[PDB]
C-alpha cells in the first residue's frame, strides 16, 4: 500500500523543517492579494 | 559586460543552484541534526550525507567543497529517471491515506 | 427632489419613466427632447407620450427609510460576498495543493534511486579491485 | 434537480453551465472568476460573462437557522486553514523531495568519476 512510503516521506519532511514546525501555516500572497482584489471590487 | 555577461553568469550560477533555490521552493530556517543522522551503510545514507551540504549551502550558506554543473547533475537526473518506474499515481486512495 | 437626472445630472422636481428608458428624466426635459430627437436619450428606443409615467413619495403606508446602515439584508449580503470570496480562496488553494502533492507523487525515485546507487557502488567495488 | 457547482462543491440555488468547459457552476462564483481570472476554472481556456448557458431549476427557527450558519462557518474556515496547513506540508514534501533527488545526482555525479579511475590505474 502506498501509506508506508507516505508516512517514510512525510516524516522525514517533518523532520526537515522541524525548526518551521512552531511557525503558523503561510497564507501565499496569490490567494492574499486574490482576496484583497475581490474585497475591492 | 556589467550587464547582459553578468546576467547570463546571474541564470547561470542561479542554474547550479538546487531545485529548491530555483523554485524558490520553501527550505528550513536551520539544518536540523536530527534529521540528518544515518547509519552511513546504504545507498540512503550517502545521499542523505550530501543532502547535508544542500542544505547548509541554502540554509547557512556554506557552499560545498565542490559542485557539479548542471550539465552534469541533469545527465546524473536522467540515469534517476531511466531507472525509476511503477511511481504512484495521485488518486483518491492517496487522498484517504494522506489525510489519515 | 432627492432624485438625479442621468442626463442633465441635477436633481430633480418632475421625475419621469418609461417602459424602454431606466435612467430618470425631468418631465420638462423628456417633453422637449421628444419633440426635437423623438428619441430615448440612453437606450434610443422611440418615445411616445403614453410611455411616461410619474413618481410621487408619501403615500399611506409607505414604510419609514431604515437609515441606522445596519440591515438584515445587508449583512446576509456581505455575508454571501465573504462566502464567495472564501470558496474562490478555498479553490485556489486546493487547485495549489493538488499540483503540488501530484508532482511530489511523480517525483517519489528515492526507493529507485536507490537501487542504482547500490549498483553503481557493487560495480565500483569490483572495478576498485579488478585493477 | 440538485445541482453541484464545481468550484464550491456545494449545491447551487441557480445552477450555470459553461460552454467551454461543460462543467456546472453557480452563476455568481463564476462570474467573480470571470471578473477576476478571466478564465475557465476547470479547463484554463478564455471565458467571459455571455458564455454561461442557465441550466433549470420553509425555514424553522431564526435562532436555530443563526446556529447553523455558526457551525457552518466554522466548518468552512476549517477547510480553508486546513488546505493551508496541507499546502505547506506538501511544498515541504516537494522540497525534500527534491532536496533527495539533487542530492542523488550528486552522487551518482561523484561515483559515476570515480568510477574512471578504474580504467587509469
Redesign the interface.
Known sequence: ???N??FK??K?????????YAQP????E??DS??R???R? | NKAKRNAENRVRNMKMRSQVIQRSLPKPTKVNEQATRATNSSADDMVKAEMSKLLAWDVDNKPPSVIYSREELDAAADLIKQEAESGPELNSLMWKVVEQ | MSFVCGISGELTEDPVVSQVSGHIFDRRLIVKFIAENGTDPISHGELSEDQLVSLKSGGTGSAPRNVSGTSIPSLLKMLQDEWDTVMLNSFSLRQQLQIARQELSHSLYQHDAACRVISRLSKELTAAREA
Open positions: 500500500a502506498l501509506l512510503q507516505v516521506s512525510l522525514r519532511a517533518q523532520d526537515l523543517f522541524y525548526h518551521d501555516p503561510p497564507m501565499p496569490e490567494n486574490l482576496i482584489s475581490m474585497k471590487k
